[PDB]
Amino acid sequence: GTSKLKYVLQDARFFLIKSNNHENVSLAKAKGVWSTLPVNEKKLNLAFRSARSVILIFSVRESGKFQGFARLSSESHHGGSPIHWVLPAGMSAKMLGGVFKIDWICRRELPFTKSAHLTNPWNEHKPVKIGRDGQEIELECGTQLCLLFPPDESIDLYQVIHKM
Ligand SMILES: CNc1nc(Cl)nc2c(Cc3cccc(Cl)c3)[nH]nc12
């Protein structure tokens, strides 16, 4: 069912995450972590304190799809587990140094063709697929986007709800 999902998405904030390769999204799904550039890291840390749920919606560049979405479970933290990200060009391991913990809500794909009817007021009402890494997505757009994803029956939202 979608009732627990809607409860998780209630009053959430949504951010578009653009990854330059598939390997880091695979790593994020396996290990429950994400790292981003310092400009976006500051935005997510601020949002994490401000909202019941902060939702990251992932898209690998050139894939024409979203690869799933997840909820922040912590602010960024340094040290510890040094994630072996596959670094793109012009990207250093110190730029991706802050590590957020994330709980996946959906690890299923959604093609961009399925979200063509959703526009993002915080990006000039362009289709929600369009946006830079870290672009915030307005509440109603982000909620409907997340509801378009196929259900992920491998995930039990019960423990996610407890962390709220
Ligand atoms: C684990 N974190 C990440 N992995 C990858 Cl492959 N790409 C990421 C981007 C997008 C981007 C924006 C500006 C410059 C560059 Cl080079 C890339 N943001 N976070 C990323």
Write up this protein.
With about 160 residues, the protein is of the alpha+beta class. It has a single domain (about 1-164), classed as ph1033 like fold (Roll), CATH 3.10.590. Helix content is about 30%, strand content about 25%. It is built from five helices and ten strands. The chain has helices at about 5-10, 20-30, 40-50, 140-150, 155-164, and strands at about 15-20, 35, 55-60, 65, 70, 100-105, 110, 120, 125, 135. The protein has a six-stranded mixed sheet with strand order 2-6-5-3-1-10. Helix 1 packs parallel to helix 5 (about 155-164). The longest helix has 13 residues, at about 40-50. It is globular, with a radius of gyration of 15 Å. The chain starts with a helix and ends with a helix. The chain binds the ligand CNc1nc(Cl)nc2c(Cc3cccc(Cl)c3)[nH]nc12. This is YTH domain-containing protein 1. It is found in: Nucleus; Nucleus speckle.
Give the topology string: H per helix, E per strand. HEHEHEEEEEEEEHH
**How would you characterize the largest beta sheet?**
6 strands, mixed
Look at the structure and name the CATH superfamily: ph1033 like domains
**Distance separating the two termini:** 20 Å
The total beta strand count reads 10
Query: What is the CATH topology assignment?
Result: ph1033 like fold
Helix content: 25-40%
Beta percentage is 15-25%
Strand arrangement in the largest pleated sheet: 2-6-5-3-1-10
Number of helices: 5
* CATH architecture heading: Roll
Gross morphology is: globular
The first-level CATH class name: Alpha Beta
Listed once per kind, the bound small molecules are: the ligand CNc1nc(Cl)nc2c(Cc3cccc(Cl)c3)[nH]nc12
Modified residues (Phosphoserine): 81, 92
Subcellular location: Nucleus; Nucleus speckle
Domain YTH: 12-149
Protein name: YTH domain-containing protein 1
